[PDB]
Ligand binder design. Structure first.
Ligand SMILES: COc1ccc(C(=O)O)cc1
Ligand SMILES: [Ca+2]
Ligand SMILES: [Ca+2]
Ligand SMILES: [Ca+2]
Ligand SMILES: [Cl-]
Length: 123
């Protein structure tokens, strides 16, 4: 769920408030997304968006009313390392992986404040 994704990013980037720093950034960070990614961070979000799209296609996810943003899963942060729990069932495990990959991606790319709250017209 969104709450866990926020926690994951904080696990890799201790100085950030994810929902404020990464939400509505570029053409893909935030609900929806299209066009050419504006930078590498935006590309991290594009990959995350695709991962969520793939999740919704899974048979295991289609039996659930929850979507990637509302489906709670289990994970832990320890020594700034993210671990998706083996107790996650198929659908939540996939989503956990999507989130973990994006959290790590965010931590390895530059942040360009200029792209915050970017106009969806540039997309
Ligand atoms: C808290 O950070 C994010 C970043 C990207 C997205 C998204 O692309 O939907 C959602 C939350
Ligand atoms: Ca998005
Ligand atoms: Ca769940
Ligand atoms: Ca366009
Ligand atoms: Cl990790």
């Amino acid at each position: 769920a969104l709450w866990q994704f926020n926690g994951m990013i904080k696990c890799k980037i201790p100085s950030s408030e994810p929902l404020l720093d990464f939400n509505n950034y570029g053409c893909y960070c935030g609900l929806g997304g299209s066009g050419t990614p504006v930078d590498d961070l935006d590309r991290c979000c594009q990959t995350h968006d695709n991962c969520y799209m793939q999740a919704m296609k899974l048979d295991s996810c289609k039996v659930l009313v929850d979507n990637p943003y509302t489906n709670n899963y289990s994970y832990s942060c320890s020594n700034n390392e993210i671990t998706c729990s083996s107790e996650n069932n198929a659908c939540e495990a996939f989503i956990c992986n999507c989130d973990r990959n994006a959290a790590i991606c965010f931590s390895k790319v530059p942040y360009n404040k200029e792209h915050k709250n970017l106009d969806k017209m540039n997309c």
